[PDB]
Design a protein around this nucleic acid. Structure first.
Ligand SMILES: [K+]
Ligand SMILES: [K+]
Ligand SMILES: [K+]
Ligand SMILES: [K+]
Ligand SMILES: [K+]
Ligand SMILES: [K+]
Ligand SMILES: [K+]
Ligand SMILES: [K+]
Ligand SMILES: [K+]
Ligand SMILES: [K+]
Ligand SMILES: [K+]
Ligand SMILES: [K+]
Ligand SMILES: [K+]
Ligand SMILES: [Mg+2]
Ligand SMILES: [Mg+2]
Ligand SMILES: [Mg+2]
Ligand SMILES: [Mg+2]
Ligand SMILES: [Mg+2]
Ligand SMILES: [Mg+2]
Ligand SMILES: [Mg+2]
Ligand SMILES: [Mg+2]
Ligand SMILES: [Mg+2]
Ligand SMILES: [Mg+2]
Ligand SMILES: [Mg+2]
Ligand SMILES: [Mg+2]
Ligand SMILES: [Mg+2]
Ligand SMILES: [Mg+2]
Ligand SMILES: [Mg+2]
Ligand SMILES: [Mg+2]
Ligand SMILES: [Mg+2]
Ligand SMILES: [Mg+2]
Ligand SMILES: [Mg+2]
Ligand SMILES: [Mg+2]
Ligand SMILES: [Mg+2]
Ligand SMILES: [Mg+2]
Ligand SMILES: [Mg+2]
Ligand SMILES: [Mg+2]
Ligand SMILES: [Mg+2]
Ligand SMILES: [Mg+2]
Ligand SMILES: [Mg+2]
Ligand SMILES: [Mg+2]
Ligand SMILES: [Mg+2]
Ligand SMILES: [Mg+2]
Ligand SMILES: [Mg+2]
Ligand SMILES: [Mg+2]
Ligand SMILES: [Mg+2]
Ligand SMILES: [Mg+2]
Ligand SMILES: [Mg+2]
Ligand SMILES: [Mg+2]
Ligand SMILES: [Mg+2]
Ligand SMILES: [Mg+2]
Ligand SMILES: [Mg+2]
Ligand SMILES: [Mg+2]
Ligand SMILES: [Mg+2]
Ligand SMILES: [Mg+2]
Ligand SMILES: [Mg+2]
Ligand SMILES: [Mg+2]
Ligand SMILES: [Mg+2]
Ligand SMILES: [Mg+2]
Ligand SMILES: [Mg+2]
Ligand SMILES: [Mg+2]
Ligand SMILES: [Mg+2]
Ligand SMILES: [Mg+2]
Ligand SMILES: [Mg+2]
Ligand SMILES: [Mg+2]
Ligand SMILES: [Mg+2]
Ligand SMILES: [Mg+2]
Lengths: 123, 154, 102, 319
RNA sequence: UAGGUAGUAGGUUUAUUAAGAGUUAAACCUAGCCAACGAUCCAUAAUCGAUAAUGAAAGUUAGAACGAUCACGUUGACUCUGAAAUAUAGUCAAUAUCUAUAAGAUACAGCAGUGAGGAAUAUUGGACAAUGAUCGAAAGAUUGAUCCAGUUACUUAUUAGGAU
RNA sequence: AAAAAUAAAAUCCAUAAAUAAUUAAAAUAAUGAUAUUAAUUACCAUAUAUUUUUAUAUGGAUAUAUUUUAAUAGUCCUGACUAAUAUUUGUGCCAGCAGUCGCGGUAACACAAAGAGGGCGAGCGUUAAUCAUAAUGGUUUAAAGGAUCCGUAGAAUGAAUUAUAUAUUAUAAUUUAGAGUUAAUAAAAUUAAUUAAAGAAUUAUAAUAGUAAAGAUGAAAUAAAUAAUUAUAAGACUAAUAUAUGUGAAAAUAUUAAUUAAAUAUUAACUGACAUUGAGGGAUUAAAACUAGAGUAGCGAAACGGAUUCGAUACCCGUGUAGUUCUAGUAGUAAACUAUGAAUACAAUUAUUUAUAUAUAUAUAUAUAAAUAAUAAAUGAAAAUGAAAGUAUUCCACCUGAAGAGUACGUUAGCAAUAAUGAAACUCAAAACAAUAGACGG
RNA sequence: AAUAUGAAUUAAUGCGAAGUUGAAAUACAGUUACCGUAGGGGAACCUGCGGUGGGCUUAUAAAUAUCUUAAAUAUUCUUACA
């Protein structure tokens, strides 16, 4: 662009990461109530029965959150805390529920990476 | 005219690439001062007044009758299969003129990028215009003069 | 090939060289500055004996073309102070070196 | 490409063979026992050539590359001893030529991989007394003693300060036998300084390298124009380098030229002291616009660069 | 959001003010004024630094903390006093609560604290010893300003055992 | 060379805390909330010597010695990016992991663990955010040149000399190289608009003799002839030349003549920077389409038929309506393309035309421009570009991953079809260009 | 009148798995493709009109050739002759 076109607005586009958790409203996490627990099928080439859950956040936004870990006790009306982070193979599941918070317990018998699964230290 | 000076800077680069020993530039005060600075700095072998057809052998007074046919003829230098005058670029452009105080000229000669102007490099000539006179930046700093940074020759 | 080195540590001035799609901007550096450049350029400088150098690569960052571009730049884009002086018939003085001379 | 690499010795050693199941040994541990040699009943390693200190003013620094890992020698004859198939120590089959003509520089190099690190020379107890008696009694200047013995002025000033501490200690019988034993042992471990030896003399022309000058400025002048150190100094807007060296030699407390009086121009008032007062007020004239604690200054207490200092009593205090 | 403006743009005169001016009110004239270098309208937001964050730098971000400035003290308007207030005053009205049922009192964005909301932010602490502020001639009185402590890894720093 | 591991225990020596004594400073005339103050000292006090500090000796104080005495870190990670080689077990596209690429289907370095190992550390991880991490950019062919030109603003850019000033700007004077005006001389007959003409053929009709098939197709079938020689009528079109060469702003433009308008080169004189570019704006703008009034031969969406075909809402054939034509308008879109905005200065060659000029021993020869072709250099991802897509300068338009989308909504304009303007959400780690070697080709 | 919210009601589009009906595109893709526009059809698509090459520059013969000392001379020649 010419010098006058730059004076009129022309310039390099700016590089800044965009929000991937718009429903949280720029909060680390938001509380919610599980509307319905569901099992979804990964997009190819993956195969599994991925446990997810529909959740209504305290701000009125309804989202789909992935339940990490082996085994969960989440039901309808269970109070859950939702954080950012998408499930890559499940399209439309852009959030994660936090294990060990609210009514969702920590992964049973988890030994490694316990802090990521709400598991307390064994004595 | 800075446009004319830009034309001359590009012309000299073109002549160096083909390695012509002699070329002509427009006959004006600014061009003559520009060429004279290059001659004194060892970038040009010769500087002669002349006409459109070639350098004058004997003095020919310039008048309105022949002003349109006057040209300045400069000799280019080549050593060790390399051109002495490899690049010639303007700093102050027609659409963006740069005037610097003597303090900022000293920073430019010390390695500091001033107003996006890359600092003076080893063996490079930066010319400055002050009160319609062209001089080396080091000379302008010695005379405490503020002026327009015109071009850089290497 | 032999590459000119200023004080056997760095390059003579700055270099803006275009090798195919690779835009190389290399700047000379003070003693003790170290090599702060693309990793490909770093290795070449180590073998060549360049100790102080700064620079950035623009556009294409293809390793193969950076290495070849760097070698070409070190030979075709540099001019020694001695070569500049002889071509112009002038004396070029390193002010920093004279300041510490007898 | 990178992977974890156990630090096995670079030199050849006798690796472990078939091992009884309860030994639970390692190749690193056995390589160390071969370096150390047998341990006697007193807990010593007499066969290792580094167990005992040198007593001839020649440092005994490790030379693994030159001896190829053979660190064992006879404790009295100092003759090389190597491990054999029997498990005993005996003369090597072939003499090591790399250990008989060692360069002078290497002898003073403690670390094999760093040839830029060398030990310093220890000053003899006589040169120290001479320097002490010349600066204090004869009244010579530190610049003269520095230029005479080839010692940097700071070192000369330190010797005077330290010898004064040794006189008070010797005047009060505070230097015990153990301290004398230790001092002599350490003295016989380092190469003694020789003022006459030109190579041993310290360079006396060193000046701190400024930062503004560290850049590389170049000037294109006429082919026959003279340009010298003074001209360069004007270009760099610094005092000539020779002047800097001269000003750095007049800093020693016992050096010539030491002067400090241009600052005795600040009006000070000492408040009246009355009986019963526990402190005296001292007032120093200042100028409005310079004196005072500024308003809205950056608080750094909660930042990694929080300023920490030490008071007159040596207690850590936040600045 | 492409047309906007009608005291609107300018001129003259009086009133009002310590004081200029369509600043307000009154009268009479001229037809102007703004606008695609974005008017008018709508939305959003307290602003800034020799403050903080980041970067080689130009910059970008924040506006908690330190400091400067503005605005507000449940909402709106008006009046009094005064050099200065549409005052955390007074008056009237609105909303809510309260008890004494009065043309009543209160409004914690002062401190502490409680409920609510939220992923999330503390003691219903001590002292006027210090630095200030108010009253008093003084003696002194008052001060949730302030100074200290409590709670909380929220941040920083130090320490959290060396030889063999 | 498979270690865990100097790791542990053990040994030596310490300090913190405790205990005891002592005790500042914040504050003094006095007042201390903090406060069970900090710090110091290790029986307390004193004298002497004694950088510090040390040391001796003394007064009181206990039984020759003099209070006691320690040390349990977590958290993430080890396929690549990315530091982590010592292996092993379970699971088997399940369970699960995942920032990106991906991992898992029985030898899983990636899942869940053991061993060993790598980080950071009273924190570690994770989520939410901020800054940095490439414009020291691009638009023939990858996102991106506006259909074209004219021209307004430009707080855009732009000749020469001299003199001042308060200085890259202003002013004044002067100048002619850019840009123009008027002639003279030579050259050319194109491009617009309008008017007036010509030509071959086609279809229809009639006549004439002359017949029985003709026409069509891959083959077929649907709808006194065909052919031949005359005569009449109508509409549309424009063979060779011909290269769209050339001309025109582009769109466009090739049968003839005329009228009006514009267009070339050089020379002479004249003006004296009056220029370039150009937001907004304006004008023109293929084909199709639309509104009126004419025309309608041939061609020909559609429609109705005939074939082909497994089917044939097609390709082929028939009948053939709109349309194609003219007049007056609307509309402003095309692969409106050189997929390449305009202007200026400049750079190495050849060949071939064209134009002007010069010369002669008159038909060539010598010059200077333009065009085209092939190139050097340079540029470029390359293909290639080649006087630009090179070296530079000035101005305008435009682009910022794909898809969604040139869509939705709104607005403006139009008789209408539509044209212009022009998003976001969701989803994904794609998507695209040049070139290389293959494979394949009815 | 504006802003916000819900909203009967209603339009467009994305991704996900395989199927169904055809075979439109990439080779001459079996009717050259595509651009603008109009009409028609289950669907891709088909047809008309002009435009573009991002398809044919992929371009490669009607052939015909001549006289001066052939050598005792050219062909050899080594810094010589001149
Ligand atoms: K606006
Ligand atoms: K007080
Ligand atoms: K660890
Ligand atoms: K390109
Ligand atoms: K043409
Ligand atoms: K003029
Ligand atoms: K203009
Ligand atoms: K325009
Ligand atoms: K017709
Ligand atoms: K343009
Ligand atoms: K087709
Ligand atoms: K079409
Ligand atoms: K079509
Ligand atoms: Mg690694
Ligand atoms: Mg007003
Ligand atoms: Mg007035
Ligand atoms: Mg009025
Ligand atoms: Mg607000
Ligand atoms: Mg800011
Ligand atoms: Mg802000
Ligand atoms: Mg606050
Ligand atoms: Mg108020
Ligand atoms: Mg109020
Ligand atoms: Mg009030
Ligand atoms: Mg309140
Ligand atoms: Mg409160
Ligand atoms: Mg709550
Ligand atoms: Mg908090
Ligand atoms: Mg509490
Ligand atoms: Mg209180
Ligand atoms: Mg203690
Ligand atoms: Mg008090
Ligand atoms: Mg007290
Ligand atoms: Mg994991
Ligand atoms: Mg397995
Ligand atoms: Mg991993
Ligand atoms: Mg694992
Ligand atoms: Mg383990
Ligand atoms: Mg810490
Ligand atoms: Mg940048
Ligand atoms: Mg361009
Ligand atoms: Mg175009
Ligand atoms: Mg286009
Ligand atoms: Mg002219
Ligand atoms: Mg017939
Ligand atoms: Mg024709
Ligand atoms: Mg042409
Ligand atoms: Mg124009
Ligand atoms: Mg046409
Ligand atoms: Mg009609
Ligand atoms: Mg049909
Ligand atoms: Mg049919
Ligand atoms: Mg048909
Ligand atoms: Mg029209
Ligand atoms: Mg369209
Ligand atoms: Mg278009
Ligand atoms: Mg066309
Ligand atoms: Mg023009
Ligand atoms: Mg549209
Ligand atoms: Mg391709
Ligand atoms: Mg077909
Ligand atoms: Mg097909
Ligand atoms: Mg086809
Ligand atoms: Mg059809
Ligand atoms: Mg067609
Ligand atoms: Mg094709
Ligand atoms: Mg082709």
């Amino acid at each position: 662009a010419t010098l006058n076109q730059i004076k009129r607005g022309s310039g390099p586009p700016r590089r800044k990461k965009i929000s991937t958790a718009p429903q949280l409203d720029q909060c680390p996490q938001r509380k919610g109530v599980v509307l319905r627990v569901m099992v979804l099928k990964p997009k190819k080439p993956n195969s599994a029965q991925r446990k997810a859950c529909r959740v209504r956040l305290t701000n009125g936004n309804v989202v789909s959150a992935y339940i990490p870990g082996e085994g969960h006790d989440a039901q309808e009306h269970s109070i859950v805390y939702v954080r950012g982070g998408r499930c890559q193979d499940l399209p439309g599941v852009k959030y994660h529920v936090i294990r060990g918070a609210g009514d969702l317990s920590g992964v049973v018998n988890r030994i490694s990476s316990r802090s990521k699964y709400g598991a307390k230290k064994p004595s | 005219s800075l446009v004319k000076l830009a034309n001359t800077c590009a012309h000299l680069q073109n002549c160096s690439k083909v390695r012509v020993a002699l070329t002509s530039i427009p006959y004006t005060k600014l061009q003559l001062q520009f060429a004279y600075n290059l001659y004194q700095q060892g970038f040009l072998s010769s500087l002669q007044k002349g006409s459109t057809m070639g350098p004058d052998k004997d003095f020919v007074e310039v008048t309105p009758d022949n002003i349109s046919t006057r040209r300045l003829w400069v000799g280019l230098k080549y050593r060790d299969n390399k051109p002495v005058l490899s690049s010639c670029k303007l700093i102050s452009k027609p659409n963006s003129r740069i005037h610097l105080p003597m303090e900022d000229m000293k920073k430019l000669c010390s390695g500091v990028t001033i107003r996006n102007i890359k600092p003076l490099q080893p063996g490079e000539l930066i010319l400055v215009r002050a009160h319609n006179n062209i001089m080396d930046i080091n000379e302008a700093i010695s005379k405490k003069l503020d002026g327009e940074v015109l071009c850089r020759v290497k | 090939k032999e590459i000119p080195r200023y004080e056997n540590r760095t390059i003579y001035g700055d270099i803006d060289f275009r090798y195919h799609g690779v835009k190389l901007h290399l700047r000379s550096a003070k003693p003790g500055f170290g090599l702060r450049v693309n990793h490909v350029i770093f290795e070449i400088c180590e073998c060549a004996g360049i100790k102080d150098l700064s620079g950035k690569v623009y556009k294409s960052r293809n390793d193969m073309n950076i290495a070849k571009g760097t070698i070409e730049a070190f030979t075709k884009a540099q001019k020694t102070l001695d070569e500049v002086a002889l071509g112009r018939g002038k004396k070029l003085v390193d002010v920093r070196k004279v300041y510490y001379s007898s | 490409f990178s992977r974890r690499r156990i630090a096995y010795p670079f030199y050849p050693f006798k690796k472990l063979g078939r091992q009884h199941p309860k030994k639970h040994d390692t190749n690193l541990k056995t390589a160390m026992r071969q370096f150390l040699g047998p341990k006697n009943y007193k807990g010593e390693y007499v066969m290792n050539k580094y167990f005992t200190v040198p007593t001839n003013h020649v440092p005994n620094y490790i030379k693994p590359d030159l001896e190829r890992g053979q660190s064992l020698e006879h404790p009295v004859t100092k003759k090389p001893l190597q491990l054999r198939y029997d498990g005993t120590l005996g003369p090597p089959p072939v003499e090591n030529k790399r250990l008989q003509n060692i360069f002078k520089d290497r002898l003073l190099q403690p670390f094999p991989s760093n040839p830029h690190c060398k030990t310093n020379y220890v000053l003899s107890p006589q040169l120290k007394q001479s320097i002490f008696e010349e600066i204090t009694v004869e009244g010579l200047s530190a610049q003269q003693v520095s230029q005479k013995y080839g010692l940097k002025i700071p070192r000369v000033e330190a010797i005077v300060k330290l010898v004064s501490v040794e006189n008070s200690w010797n005047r009060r019988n505070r230097v015990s036998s153990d301290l004398k034993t230790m001092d002599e042992t350490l003295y016989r471990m380092f190469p003694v300084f020789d003022s006459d030896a030109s190579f041993k003399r310290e360079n006396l022309s060193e000046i701190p390298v400024p930062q503004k000058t560290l850049a590389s400025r170049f000037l294109t002048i006429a082919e026959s124009e003279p340009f010298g150190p003074v001209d360069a100094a004007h270009v760099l807007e610094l005092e000539p380098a020779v002047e800097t060296l001269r000003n750095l030699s007049t800093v020693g407390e016992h050096s010539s030229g030491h002067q400090q009086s241009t600052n005795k121009n600040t009006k000070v008032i000492y408040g009246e002291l009355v009986e019963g007062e526990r402190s005296q007020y001292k007032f120093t004239n200042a100028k409005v616009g310079k004196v005072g604690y500024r308003y809205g200054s950056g608080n750094r207490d909660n930042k990694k660069d929080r300023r920490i200092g030490f008071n007159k009593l040596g207690q850590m205090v936040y600045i």
